[PDB]
């Protein structure tokens, strides 16, 4: 009977909470109280990439630290040279309601998807010199909220139907599907060594998945509401989570619990995107209030603010060189930010 | 600058010329979200837009008086919708379809309307409200077998407004039920629509030929109300 399983699950959850409490010897804010403050990080809008018609919904930096993909619900992908503002490509999408895009580490392929429930991967450099769809990956039963390339031929994908899937592109079929979220999975984040990814999924929870074993290794459950954004800490042993709580939280994959909660009571609006810096000490978070905030990830002090946008921030990413922060928002512009001494 | 850096600027300008051509089609087309429960006749409406002509979304293109309309019907999504609905914050209108004959489900339709109306991002978007299946409503009220007072207790103290414009031969029974439902949605619309957006109630039947005309007139009036408010003439 179901009641015996439900109570056994209850006692296992109590055991897991007890185990987490047993290792929770000291909080991060005690250990880092001796650490020197970051100071007032302040960044200039260096360049504004303009010429999307509708709201920008996703963006992704290439591995070259130089090229941007940007996706707008007018149905265009624009690829930008951030050093020059040049539009190196512009791709007319099959359906306007794009919600995710991704840009391969080989640099050669770009993918996007959304409310069509189909992942479209574009080859940028065919012998004819003109962009075309190489594959359409169909089989998700819900909108694709996030996708991320593992390789020239493998893409992980995230859907409103509560499932993730790992696709072989050439054959166009799911190698594995990841199941046991209770709500819309909103964002992926791949580990720096591509064996693990985390996802958060419109319940209180984020889950760690093994790409090769096909199974959920760990479940994190601190948040009050939907996790919109997820991002690995650069060491690959922790990850940050942004939510409609108007809170960010950092989880460690090896203490199996929250380290720290970033929350200022002057702000009561949901987190839309999250990124770390290269060192990991700066956590950058985008908000429904038309803003981004910069947090000392070790001390939970609000170090800085990037108040440059006219509408909600929708996407946010640092380059792999750590050299710039790109921000996109529903005001149809991408703003590129840096400091100078 | 020289060599490939000039060619890069040349390509960028060719892209700019195509973007300037696509912007015209984007601005000259009006986008609509068709939204409604499984009992609502949204599919038979879509099938009769063709006079004017695993997938997660469907697209219907139709034209009235040389204005081009894109109407989107949400397909194989899951029932939770709080996240994907945020994509439509920049449509011209929500076309909300209701089965006026299912008194047992009119309350969930009203809660769905409350949810759409008070959402933070749709706060600018007007709702075009097709109170569909009026023939079934009329037959049901005339047969009298199923009451409405036990689904909505305040119906017994509701009396037909002088606003009403009943069609020929409509009984006061059917007219009073019809306008009661209409005002049940208007109470929601009028409670929190702080001038930014309005709703446009229409009594309709699935066989109606004139629904594209209705959508055309409602979009016209939405944009007029928007600009007259922007000009402070309203």
């Amino acid at each position, epitope marked *: 009977e179901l009641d015996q399983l439900r109570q056994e699950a209850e006692q296992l959850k109590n055991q897991i909470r007890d185990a987490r409490k047993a290792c929770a010897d000291a909080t991060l804010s005690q250990i880092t109280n001796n650490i020197d403050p970051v100071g007032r990080i302040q960044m200039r809008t260096r360049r504004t990439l303009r010429g999307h018609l509708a709201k920008i919904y996703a963006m992704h930096w290439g591995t070259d630290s130089r090229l941007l993909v940007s996706a707008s619900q007018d149905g265009k992908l624009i690829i930008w040279d951030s050093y020059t503002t040049n539009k190196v490509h512009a791709i007319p999408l099959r359906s306007s309601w794009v919600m995710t895009c991704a840009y391969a580490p080989s640099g050669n392929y770009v993918a996007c998807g959304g409310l069509d429930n189909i992942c479209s991967i574009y080859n940028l450099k065919t012998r004819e010199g003109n962009v075309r769809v190489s594959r359409e990956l169909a089989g998700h039963t819900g909108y694709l909220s996030c996708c991320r390339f593992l390789d020239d031929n493998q893409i992980v994908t995230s859907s409103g139907d509560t499932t993730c899937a790992l696709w072989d592109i050439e054959t166009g079929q799911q190698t594995t599907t990841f199941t046991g979220h209770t709500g819309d999975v909103m964002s992926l984040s791949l580990a720096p060594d591509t064996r693990l990814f985390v996802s958060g999924a419109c319940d209180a929870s984020a889950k760690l998945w093994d790409v090769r074993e096909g199974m959920c290794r760990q479940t994190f459950t601190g948040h009050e509401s939907d996790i919109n954004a997820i991002c690995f800490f650069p060491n690959g042993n922790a990850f940050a989570t942004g939510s409609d709580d108007a809170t960010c939280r950092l989880f460690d994959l090896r203490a199996d619990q929250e380290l720290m909660t970033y929350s200022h009571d002057n702000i009561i609006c949901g987190i839309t995107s999250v990124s770390f810096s290269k060192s990991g000490r700066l956590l950058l978070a985008g908000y429904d209030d038309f803003n981004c905030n910069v947090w000392d990830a070790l001390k939970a002090d609000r170090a800085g603010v990037l108040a440059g946008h006219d509408n909600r921030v929708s996407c946010l990413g640092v380059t792999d060189d750590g050299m710039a922060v790109a921000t996109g928002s529903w005001d149809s512009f991408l703003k590129i930010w840096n400091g100078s001494s | 600058l020289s060599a490939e850096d000039k060619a890069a600027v040349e390509r960028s300008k060719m892209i700019e010329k195509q973007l300037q051509k696509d912007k015209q089609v984007y601005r000259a087309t009006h986008r609509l979200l068709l939204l409604g429960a499984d009992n609502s006749g949204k599919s038979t409406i879509v099938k009769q837009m063709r006079i004017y002509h695993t997938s997660g979304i469907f697209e219907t293109k139709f034209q009235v008086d040389k204005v081009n309309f894109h109407m989107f019907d949400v397909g194989a999504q899951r029932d939770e919708r709080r996240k994907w609905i945020q994509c439509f914050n920049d449509v011209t209108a929500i076309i909300f379809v209701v089965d006026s004959s299912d008194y047992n489900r009119l309350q969930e339709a009203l809660n769905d309307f409350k949810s759409i109306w008070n959402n*933070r991002w749709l706060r600018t978007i007007s709702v075009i409200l097709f109170l569909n299946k009026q023939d079934l409503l009329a037959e049901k009220v005339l047969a009298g077998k199923s009451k409405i007072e036990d689904y909505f207790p305040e119906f017994a103290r509701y009396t037909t407004p002088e606003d009403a414009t009943p069609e020929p031969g409509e009984d006061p029974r059917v007219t009073r039920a019809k306008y009661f439902i209409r005002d049940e949605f208007l109470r929601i619309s009028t409670a929190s629509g702080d001038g930014r957006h309005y709703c446009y109630p229409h009594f309709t039947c699935s066989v109606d030929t004139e629904n594209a005309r209705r959508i055309f007139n409602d979009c016209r009036d939405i944009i007029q109300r928007m600009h007259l408010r922007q000009y402070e003439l309203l």
Partner: nanobody, 127 residues
């Protein structure tokens, strides 16, 4: 973890009374708008009533308006439904349900077939 322990249901004769109670845990209860939902056997889910953060608004389905009343206590994270004039058609499983996001008044998804922020619920039987 966010959890909602609905606790009060049981069996009554017609005209009886019951008082459902939900104990809420794992979230800042005062920030969230809250609902009760029920499911009669063989029917889908249906919305019963609503309460804002501080009681500044209450709403009910027309089948209930005088018969049930919600109450709320932010000081001990409990949500109530005092039912005063039960009828056979009230025989249903009742679920306490929370709105998805704080500080916001669009109560999306609370009746959805699967929904995260809703309790296991308790059956009420009216004989």
């Amino acid at each position: 973890q966010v959890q909602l322990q609905e606790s009060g249901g049981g069996l009554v004769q017609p005209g009886g009374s019951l008082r459902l109670s939900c104990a809420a845990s794992g979230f800042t209860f005062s920030n969230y708008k809250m609902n009760w939902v029920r499911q009669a056997p063989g029917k889908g889910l249906e919305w019963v009533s609503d309460i804002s953060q501080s009681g500044a608004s209450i709403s009910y389905t027309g089948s209930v308006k005088g018969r049930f009343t919600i109450s709320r206590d932010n000081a001990k994270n409990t949500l109530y439904l005092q039912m005063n004039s039960l009828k056979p058609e009230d025989t249903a499983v009742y679920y306490c349900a929370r709105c998805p996001a704080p500080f916001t008044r669009d109560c999306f998804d609370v009746t959805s077939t699967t929904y995260a922020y809703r309790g296991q619920g308790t059956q009420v039987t009216v004989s």
